[model samples]
Target chain A: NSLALSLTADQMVSALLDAEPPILYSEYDPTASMMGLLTNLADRELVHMINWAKRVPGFVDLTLHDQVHLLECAWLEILMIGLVWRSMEHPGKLLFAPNLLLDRNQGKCVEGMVEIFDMLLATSSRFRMMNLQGEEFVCLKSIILLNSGVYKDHIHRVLDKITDTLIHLMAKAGLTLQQQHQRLAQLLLILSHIRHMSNKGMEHLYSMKCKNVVPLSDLLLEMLDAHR
Target chain B: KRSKKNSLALSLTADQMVSALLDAEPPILYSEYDPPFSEASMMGLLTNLADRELVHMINWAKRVPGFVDLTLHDQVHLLECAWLEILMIGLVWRSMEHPGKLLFAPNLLLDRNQGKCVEGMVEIFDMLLATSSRFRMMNLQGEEFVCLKSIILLNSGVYTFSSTLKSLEEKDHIHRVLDKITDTLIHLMAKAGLTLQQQHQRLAQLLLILSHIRHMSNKGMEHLYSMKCLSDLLLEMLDAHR
Candidate 1:
C-alpha cells in the first residue's frame, strides 16, 4: 500500500491554492515543470525539496502540521525519483528553477523541512528501509536537496542561495552576521562529510560489483554525518 | 494340630534350618546362605503377586500387628509378599475390567506404626546412597539400587525430618535424604546419557518432591535454594557430558 499521497507537484500546488487564504502562485506555468523536476531528482532527496519550498513566499507562515505534510509528500516523491534514477544509466541531473512571479509558497520552511527529514530518516532507519540501492540516504539527501531547492541552477545556486536565504531568514537580516556565518559554515562542513561518505558508499558498491543498489549502512553513515 | 505345627517349625533350630535351607534349590525359605532376595527382585515379585490377589493381601497385612513391628528390612519383605498377592489380583481386576481397589495400603500400614517405621529406613538408605559413590566398587547399578532403596524408605515414612532447614538441627536427616535422591538421579542421568533438557525435567521433579517434604515440615526456603544449586550443578555436568 502507498504510505504517502502520490499527488504531482502541480496537484499539490492546486490543493494549496484551494486552501483558506488561498496561496496564489504567479509561477503556475512552471508548477508542472518543478513537479516533474522534483520527482526525477531522486528518492530521499527531501533536502532539495525543502530548500525549494523555503524560497517560496509565505512558506514559513504555514501551520506546522501542514508544513510537515507538504514535506512528507515531497519526500515520498523524492524516493520514487531516486528509485527510478538508480535503474537508469547516465541519467542527467534534473534541476528546479525558482519562479519570480509566485508569492513564495507558504507551505514550506527550513525548520519544518528539517523536522520532517529527521522524522523520516529515523523511521526509515528503525524499519531498515532502503532505497533502490538499499542505502539509507534519507537524512543526507533531505538536507542537500532542500538546500538546493531555493534557487535557479547556477544562477542563484549554492553561493548566492546560502548567503541570501540563510542570512535573511536565520541570521535576522545580518544581525550577529559573523556568528550566523560560522553556524552556516559548520552546517556546510557537516553536509560536506555526508556528501563525501555518500560518494565513497557508491564507490564501494561499484567496487563490490553490486549494481542493483547500495546497502543501508552507507546511507546510514551519511545520515550520521548529516546529524553531526 | 496348628499348635503342633508351630512347635515343630520353632523347634527346628535357626542353624539347622538355615543350613538345610541353604542347600535347597532356590534356597529354602529364610535360608542364611541364600542371598537375601535383592530388594529389586522382592519388589518385582510382590508387584507380580499384587496384580492378582491385592484385596486379600492388603486385608491380611492390615490385620497383622507383627507386620507393623518387623524391622524395616523385614517389613519391606512382608510388603513385597503382600504386594505379590496384590499384583495377582490387580491383573485379574484389569482383565475383568473391574474397578475394585487392588493396590496395597502400605501407607496405612506406615501410619499405623505412628509414621516411625519407614521414616527411620529413609534415613538409613539416604545415608547409604549419598556415600555409595565413595566406595571403589560401586557401579551405576549399585547407585540405582541405593536410589530404589531410598524411594522405598521414603514410602515407608521412617526417616522424615521434624525440621525443614538443611542447616536446622534436623538438617542432617534432611540432607541425607535429599543428597541420596539427588545423587541417584544424577548417576542415572550420566549412565543413561540423558540430554540436558531431560535432566532438567528430572531435576525439577526431584527438587519439587524434596521441597514438598521440606514445606511439610515448615522448613525455611534456604534449603530450596541449595537444592536448586545442586540441580544447576547436575545440569552443568549433563551439559559437559553432552
Candidate 2:
C-alpha cells in the first residue's frame, strides 16, 4: 500500500510561515564579536528552530528518531536558507539577526568566519538577484527541510506532494510554463549551494569550538557531532 | 546498632563549601592585560577577559548551594540574570583591597588611564573604583564576599520562565536557598567579633552594597552594549538583562 502524508499547498505554506520563529534582533549590539554574536543568536534561534521544524506539515509523521535525525542533519541548511532569505534584500551584509547586520569586512576579525560569511553573503546576493519572493522563499525552505534525509518511498511521496504544492503556488503567482520551469530549476539548484554552506558552517563551528571562541549550545553541538 | 561515625561526620560549613567551590577555579588572567593599551588591544583584552570570566562564573554557579538542585532552566536563567552582578561583586571583592583601580584578574589590573583606551569605560571605572573603596572601608572578608555573591545569585535573579506554573515551586525553593546562605553570612559576621547590634548593622551594610552591585551591573551592561565586545555567554547574559 502506498500511503502518503497529505497537506494542501496553502496549508503547507501557511504552516511554514506560522512556525517561523520571532527574530529578536532589535536590541542586539552590532559591534559584538562576530563569533560571539552568531553563537548567541544560535542559542536563541535553535530552540525555536527545533519547534519550527516539528511544526512543518507532515514532519511529525516520520518516526520520532527519523524526525530528530533529519532535523539534526538539516538544521544548518535550513538556518542558512532562512539567513540568506532575510539578507536577500541587502546584498552587502548579512542581517544574521535584526540590527546585528555584518558586512564581509566586519567579519575579518574572526579568522575563518570571513570565508563562511562571504559564502553566505554570496548566497544572499543570489537570492536577491533572483528576486525570490517570500512565498516562493517559504516553499523553497519547506522543500529543503524535507529533502535533508535519505527518505523512503513514503518520504519521497511527501516531497513530491510539496513540489506539487510549489507548482500550484507558482501558477497562482502567474508564471507561464517557461517562467515556472526556470524558477523551479533555479530554486532547486540552491539546494546544492545550501548543502555546501551547511558543511562549511559546521566545519567553522567545530574549529571555533576548538579555539573556545564561542559557546556552542547543546543543540548545535549535537547537530555538529551527530555523526560522531 | 546505629553507626556513630556516620552520624557525627563533619561536612564543610556552607561558607567553607562556598569558599572552596569558588576557590577551586583560580581566576584566569586576561592574556593581553599589559599596558600600552590601544583601542584594538584593550577592547580585545576586555572581551577575552569577559569571555573567560563568564566561563568561570558559570562553573562556579554550578557548584553553589542548591544551584545544582535547580532545574536546568532555572539554573541557566539564574546564571544569565545574575552573572553581571556576580561578576561585579567578584570584581569589587578583588578590588576592595586596592583603591583607585579595578582588578579584573590578579595581573589584569587597570588604572584610570588604562580604562580610557575603551571609550566611556572611564565612567565605569570610576564607579567600580568607588564601590571597591567602600567595600574596602567595610573590610569585607572573603567569607562575607562569597555569601554576598550567593545572595546576589539568588535574589537578583529574574525567573527564566516566570509565566509557567511550575516556576512557582522553584521560586520558593530558591528563597529557601537564599535564606540558608544569608544565615551563613550572619554566622561569618558573628565570627568577625561583631556584637548582635553591630552584626545587625554590618549585615545591613553588606546587604546595602547590593545596590551598588545592581547599579554597577546596570552601568556595566550599558557600557558593554556600546563596546560590542562581549562573548557569547556574556551576550546571552546581557540579553537576559535587556
Candidate 3:
C-alpha cells in the first residue's frame, strides 16, 4: 500500500533487508544446484533474510536503494552471526553449507578467508559456551542486520526491541547479573570482531573474484559493489 | 483397484515438487505476534507453523510421482500417520537455537518447568532439544535437514501406507535425490577441513543424529494425538486440502 511510502527515512530504514524463513519445516533443498547451478540461492537466501525483518513489527519499510545499501553494509555481519548460531552444534567446524566447513585444513587453501572464519569460529564458540538460545540468536541477527550504517537518525526503536529481548532472555538465562552484562558486552565485543571480518570478508570476496575461484552471482556482486 | 493403482503411478517433475514445496506460508508481522502468548495461543502458533508444513505434506502426496494414485481415503490415512512426524522433524531443527528456552513458535516459548507442565510434553521437548542440539552440534546443513525430513516422512513403521509397486517405484526420485543430498553432505564433511580419522568417526557420529530423529518422529505423533484427544479439538490445522 502507498500507506507504507509516507514514513520518514529512519522508519523506512528498518525493513529493507531480505528474509529467509526458519529452516525447520522447509520442504525445499538444492542438491547439485545451490552451490553450483543456482548460485543465486545464496542471494535468494539473503533476500529471504530481509523478508523476516519485514515481519518485525518494530522493523522494516525501506527503498530498494536503502535495502541494497543496508544489505551491503550489514550482510556479512548477519552472516557472521548466523554462523555463530549454526556452528555451535559443531565444535571445530564452521557451517558454510551442509557439506562445506572451515577448519585448520581449509585454512591452508584460502589463507585470507581462513582468518575471518577462524575468528568467526572462535566467536561462535564463545556464543555456544554462553548457551545462546533462540530469542537471543533471533535478537542478535536483528542487532547485526539493523546496523546498516546508512542512516544518521537511525532506528533505535526497532533495535531496542531486539536488545530488550536479548536482555529478557538473559535474565531468565540464569546468568549472574554481572555475567549477564558481561555476556551482552561480550556479544558486542564479538560483534566488533565480526565487523572486522565483514570488512575482511569483502577483501576476501573480492580477492576470490579476482582469482576467479568461487562463482560470484551478479546480484551478489552488485550488493558487494554497494559496500564499496 | 490394484491395476488402477499401478497405472496411476504418475511421476511429478522435479519442477513440480520444488514448486509445491517452496510455496511456503507467509510471514506474520511482529505487531500481530506480540508477547505473553497463552497456552492456547502457544499451541495455535505451533500448529500454525505445523500447518504450513502440511502444505508440503499434501503437495508431496499429491504431486510426488505416484502418491496420488491411491484412493483419497488412503491418502488421508497416510498423511494422518506422517503429519505429526513431519512437524516434529521440521520444528525440532527450528527449535535448536533456544536451549534454555523451548521455542514452540516465534512468540511462544516454554521454560523447562513450563515445558514439563503438560503431561508428556517435557519428555517430548527433552527429546526435541537433544535432537536439535545434535543438529547444532553436527552443524547439519540444509541438505542434511531436508534429507532427514524425507527419511522421516517415508519410513514404513507404525506409520503404514500402501506398498504398491508403483508407489514404491515412484519414490525413485526421492531416493535419487536423497542419495545426492547425502553425497553432498559427505563431501562437505570430508572437505570441511577435518582430519581423516575425524571424517571416519564424524560421519558415523552424524548418522547418530539422523538415527535419533527417526525414533523421535514416532514420539512426536503420540504427543500430537494426546493433545488432540485432551482438547477435544478437531485437528483442523489450516487444512490446506479444504
Worst 10 residues of 1 chain B by lDDT: B25-34
Q: How many backbone overlaps does candidate 1 show? A: 53
**lDDT, candidate 2, B68-162, per-residue tens:** 66678778887776677887778877887778788887767888878888878876788778778878877887777777787677665532334
Second chain alone, TM-score for each candidate: 0.25, 0.86, 0.63
Listed in order, the DockQ scores are: 0.01, 0.01, 0.01
If ranked by TM-score, best first, what sequence of candidates would result? 2, 3, 1
Interface RMS for model 3? 21.5
Worst lDDT window (10 residues) for model 2 chain A? A177-186
Quality of candidate 1 docking, DockQ = 0.01
Model 2 spans with C-alpha error above 4 angstroms:
A1-228, B1-30, B33-35, B158-165
lDDT of 1 by residue, B4-87 (tens): 212222334323323322232121111112233443443333333323333344344433222233344444443532232222
Model 3 chain B weakest lDDT span, ten residues long: B23-32
Best by lDDT: 2
Per-residue lDDT over A1-228 for candidate 2, one digit per residue giving the tens place of the 0 to 100 score = 333345566876777777788776744544355666677677677788888877776677768888887787778888888889999888688887777776877657787676668777767876876688877787777666666654244654566666666667767889764354445544654565566567657666876776665567776787778733
Model 2 DockQ, alpha carbons vs. true complex: 0.01
